[PDB]
């Protein structure tokens, strides 16, 4: 249909509205004094939030420039989010802040490419510097301050999620999901486990717990679907003479299969049980040789070219004890060769490596997990709903900071990683005079974060930025205490990797902000 | 629909405001200090972009005459983007220069047709003036100069083009994609490689890598669909006493004849694997026979009066290695005798004479580069999607550039050859004097582009026309570093083509457009 | 629904006032002067036009009544273009002037009926001296004239189309196509050829122009579709014998018959092809049975009690060369005999001048053209489509300017031989005063045009048109140049085909919409 074109300061004045709007919408939430956010939802009743990228990700104005501007803003936030998964308010004010004052810049008559140029050299310094001055995160406690300082500074949470990531290992999986009591819950699954249970209720030899419980059986592995029992009498027969229990792990077994296995259970003659394999197609290949490979059995499939009646004692797998319940099995202590087993990991850990979807990564990640390591759920407890949503994310933002933490390594908190890198670029230079103010733009709005900061306290930004500048080292403001003092003896830590991508992120999207000419869209 | 027409100078200065509009909107991104411009879309966020005929493709006004006006001149900038793919916003400013200028000449009573015929006349002349002033362009330090300056002067884009090109060598093909690293890549692969992968995972030999790799191998090409093994049973039984491995490129392969390939792979006694047929239907074809061609083999097709049964090792091609990853196959080092490879590039050139469309023609060229040559990919790297998106935009118009300046030529950039075309153009004249009116009116247009970047760098145009009107040669205004020099010295080079078709398309138009005397459209 | 009714002169006035908005709209493109008028579509980009029909199809107004008037007037030039394919605009001028006159003689008391009787009784005198005035136009100077004048004073497009009828001849077939050069293109085509190519690709045996050349083969024409191979073993045979090349036409072969031929011409036994037979219905076998006349072979039909079993060398037609591409197929210097020729293009002629058709008769033409003479095909060359269409257009109007010229003759173009022929008849009575009145309205209505080319011209038409009046013969005037001289001379010829259809049909209208005496149509 018909547009609408506006030129040079109008569009500037009006696109500087729209991101101040979803900045100021955005940037309440930060700090330990930063409060809450409530969201509409159309489906059920609203949601109390403290995440930047969830009230960023509802804004949208009437004005249609004002949604140019605001709609361009809220990338750096979903950038922010889906690379570290935490840090998008900072991304937020440091993107609001270069875009204010780089209009100002343009507006004394400066080059906007050049000052885009020196923007970029200025973060690329930066970035450099802030490598330069991370620390190794290595011990528990570092990491249990890490979580409790990313979850709003609750010590439960950071000192729940240490104690999983020590309980799991350096390799593992771990997860959230709402609870049911009011008191937070952590549970550990070592060995491999897979949720699928027994097929015939008529397995069970403990009514106490409703499980089925064998010690030193034998594993038998199968793509194709049990119909008859013409195939499975001569390895019932093999392991009858042997006496040791027997677990059927295929495709599926039909009524009547099933039914001679369990009046054999009943006679006294074999201990057998039968289960489905997990997922669906080359996933649940791919889970039945882990399988295999972890119980120190073979596959035996019809597209390789052996059949099940050919099978022997030495393609049934060995494990020290097997649980199924209702709606779960486990193997514990499978007989596996380890080398094997590291040979399995490293080749899926080389196709992690080319993957690049989220979803695939995930699942890999998990079946590493499984495999070789352990998983382990975090139950979040809440008496309401919306307690409960709250509390969830805040638990997801400590584990993904410490998870990021473990992976790179942590600098001062509070705003003062940023202050020392930009105290130690004073001497940075460029080609032409509006390089250099586009250098010093990037400088003075890489002091964003802690005068918001002090702002949501309640006290003097400007003369608490400027005490802070006058120290060194890690010199800081408590804003819990209000008090200064060393930032790492008080347990405020901050990620390298969170910190790095929210500027670079900012910086990418503000650059491209400033040189904005004239915008066109539709009539109103 | 009821419809309004409206006579002479009413539809001419409606026209004028509208091909106003269209101008203004499109001509702020013109030169190295030409700025941005924000595009609204309504399927996600806004795109910012710095091309004139992605500017120009949605400026639609409320007015119907000013809209009819916006349509007119809209078609400069499409065909200037088709032919050459670089030199829009040129083409755009010169086609509103020559329509304003014939305008104001109409109004003083002179006859359109005429004035149409000068400026025909002119350009013409002009065309083969530019033809006479171009000098060629082979080296690799001009191609990096042009992909530079093509590329809103970047000079690491510039040379990955230029090294890209020299690497690939003259005939293959360079494509862009988005990247997912923060720095700029090139990938460069020799020989012929199809996006087919293997049918089953159970014929790798190199789990390290999770490819299968071959040795020496034969090659079997058959049209046929493979279903049962019988007809395979001879030429398996010949490479298995020949001992050379064997590769099978077939329609499909079902389970029956991949359980005994798969057997026999594993069992050690023949090493095969199977791949799927690239290309559906008249492609897939042709690029088998050029596979065979390449392999010095021979097609296996049931159409031609042969069965796969009756092959023998005359049939088989050979190739000194085969690499096959999950998603690629690889032939390197074929064995088929040139002069047969230099028919087959012959023939399928020939049949690229007489392409209709561009959709043939990359497909045609794509396989030209594959039978010899090379096919190289550039995979730019941005942190933020609309970065990205500018990033790559840009880098299709160095490509494009690079392009047309080897085909064709060079000549001095900056607006400074048409200025001295329309300076060797002072003695032209005509039939009578409206013609004579006409050739002026072109002339004193050829000097828009040099104006209107004075204008953009924030200079004044007069004075700096008027001082590179005075000069000889190559002696030229530099932009960026607002300095006079000889502008091949600098390194400032534009192809004679894309200055040449813009030109041409846009006296096309602007000649059409200056003589309407009404103009019929829909009610409001 | 409910209807409005008025009633005398308010229904003439708002008749005359859409007349008079709807010849305003179209008459401003009349002349060498005249200029162009842009029409509005609502599916892609408004297109530059001056033809008269092209303007009036689209002019539609919001008031009823005069919506009416226009509707009837439209007729005029739709007819026109019909009819003859030129002279729109000078029909559309004298409908309206002769409405003009006529109402205001109706206003003056006059009786419609016996001025619509004067005028008819004028327009049928002035047809016959029309017919007296006419001169033969058979050379090519001639008909290289009239093509300029008709194509807008375009030298190149009248020399083309003098040469191209030159070399088709006098019963041919020439059409215009879109091009793709900057110039145009004249392609003409030697023998006869049909839009079918080969079958299967396996036939090509010159990769250089990527077709096949049979040297002197024989044509096998079967009307029944072939799929068994037993009936083509005899023909086959008898012709592998002779070592000459074979073509068979039939209306489709299936694979299975396609394979022993394609067999058969790899191993070198007999070089044949296989070609479709073009058309569907009757019109296939008609010319199909035309092919085996040109070719002098009979046609192996089942509906004729034919059998191809018992086919000999008789009933195969030669040729001097067949050429086949992937579209096209070509048969060169057929051997036949020439009064079989004639007699067969006289029966297709008899025919012709039977159809009531104009889509039935065009087919019949080209199948003449084909059996006798040639088809050319005229390829039109812009930069733009705009300018492509408006060229296309231009040629049209030349081509069929010149088939009407050479069909009846050319008289003095620029609006005097209606000057001549109005002057002629100044002693024209009827039966009573009203009937003298009307015969006086045509003959001064007959000199519009001129009065409307010179006023396109900028100039006075009063002393132009008295000017001319004085003189005798071919005297007028030339508005390209602007001073008078002899007509014939400088090379302006009109068709007089043109010229009595476009004031017969003027007439027609104008004389039945004088009679109005009250309009109804709906309420707005
Ligand atoms: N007690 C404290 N004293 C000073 N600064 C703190 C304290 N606790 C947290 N901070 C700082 O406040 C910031 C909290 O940001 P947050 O509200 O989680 O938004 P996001 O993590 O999305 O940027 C952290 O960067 C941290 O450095
Ligand atoms: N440093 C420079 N000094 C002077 N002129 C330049 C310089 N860089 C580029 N130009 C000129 O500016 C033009 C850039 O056009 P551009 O904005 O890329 O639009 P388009 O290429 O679509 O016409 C080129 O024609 C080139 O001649
Ligand atoms: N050079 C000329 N001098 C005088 N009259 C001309 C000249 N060229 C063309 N004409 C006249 O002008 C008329 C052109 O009509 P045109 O605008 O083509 O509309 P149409 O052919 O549809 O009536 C012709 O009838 C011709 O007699
Ligand atoms: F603002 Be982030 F989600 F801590
Ligand atoms: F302005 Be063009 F797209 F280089
Ligand atoms: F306007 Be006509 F068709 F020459
Ligand atoms: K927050
Ligand atoms: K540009
Ligand atoms: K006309
Ligand atoms: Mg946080
Ligand atoms: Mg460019
Ligand atoms: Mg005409």
Do not use: W
């Amino acid at each position: 249909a018909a547009k609408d074109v506006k030129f040079g300061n109008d569009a500037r004045v009006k696109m500087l509205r729209g991101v101040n709007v979803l900045a100021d919408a955005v940037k309440v939430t930060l700090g330990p004094k930063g409060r809450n956010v409530v969201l509409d939802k159309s489906f059920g009743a609203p949601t109390i939030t403290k995440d930047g990228v969830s009230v960023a990700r509802e804004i949208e104005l009437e004005d249609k420039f004002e949604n140019m501007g605001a709609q361009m803003v809220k990338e750096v936030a979903s950038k922010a989010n889906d690379a570290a998964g935490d840090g998008t308010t900072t991304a937020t004010v440091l993107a609001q802040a270069i875009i204010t004052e780089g209009l100002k810049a343009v507006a004394a008559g400066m080059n906007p490419m050049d000052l885009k140029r020196g923007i970029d050299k200025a973060v690329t310094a930066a970035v450099e510097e802030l490598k330069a001055l991370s620390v190794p995160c290595s011990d528990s406690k570092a990491i249990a301050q890490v979580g409790t300082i990313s979850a709003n500074s609750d010590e439960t949470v950071g000192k729940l999620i240490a104690e999983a990531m020590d309980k799991v290992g350096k390799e593992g999986v771990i997860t959230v999901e709402d609870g049911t009591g009011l008191q937070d819950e952590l549970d550990v699954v070592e060995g491999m486990q897979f949720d699928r249970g027994y097929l015939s209720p008529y397995f069970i030899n403990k009514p106490e717990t409703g499980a089925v419980e064998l010690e030193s059986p034998f594993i038998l592995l199968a793509d194709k679907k049990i119909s008859n029992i013409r195939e499975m009498l001569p390895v019932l027969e093999a392991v009858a003479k042997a006496g040791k229990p027997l677990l059927i792990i295929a495709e599926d077994v039909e009524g009547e299969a099933l039914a001679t296995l369990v009046v054999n259970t009943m006679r006294g003659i074999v201990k057998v049980a039968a289960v489905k394999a997990p997922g669906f197609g080359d996933r649940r290949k791919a889970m039945l040789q882990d399988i295999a490979t972890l119980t120190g059995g073979t596959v035996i499939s019809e597209e390789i070219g052996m059949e099940l009646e050919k099978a022997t004692l030495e393609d049934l797998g060995q494990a020290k004890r097997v649980v199924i319940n209702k709606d779960t099995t486990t193997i514990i202590d499978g007989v596996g060769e380890e080398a094997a087993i590291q040979g399995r990991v490293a080749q899926i850990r080389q196709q992690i490596e080319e993957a690049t979807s989220d979803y695939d990564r995930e699942k890999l990640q998990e079946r590493v997990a499984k495999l070789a390591g352990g998983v382990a759920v975090i139950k979040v407890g809440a008496a309401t709903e919306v307690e409960m949503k709250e509390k969830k994310a805040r638990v997801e933002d400590a584990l993904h900071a410490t998870r990021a933490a473990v992976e790179e390594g942590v600098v001062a908190g509070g705003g003062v990683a940023l202050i020392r890198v930009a105290s130690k670029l004073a001497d940075l230079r460029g080609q032409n005079e509006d390089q250099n103010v586009g250098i010093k733009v990037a400088l003075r709005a890489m002091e964003a974060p802690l005068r918001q900061i002090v702002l949501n306290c309640g006290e003097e930004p400007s003369v608490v930025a400027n005490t802070v500048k006058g120290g060194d080292g890690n010199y800081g403001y408590n804003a819990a205490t209000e008090e200064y003092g060393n930032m790492i003896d008080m347990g405020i830590l901050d990620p390298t990797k969170v910190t790095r991508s929210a500027l670079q992120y900012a910086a990418s999207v503000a650059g491209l902000m400033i040189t904005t000419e004239c915008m066109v869209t539709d009539l109103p």
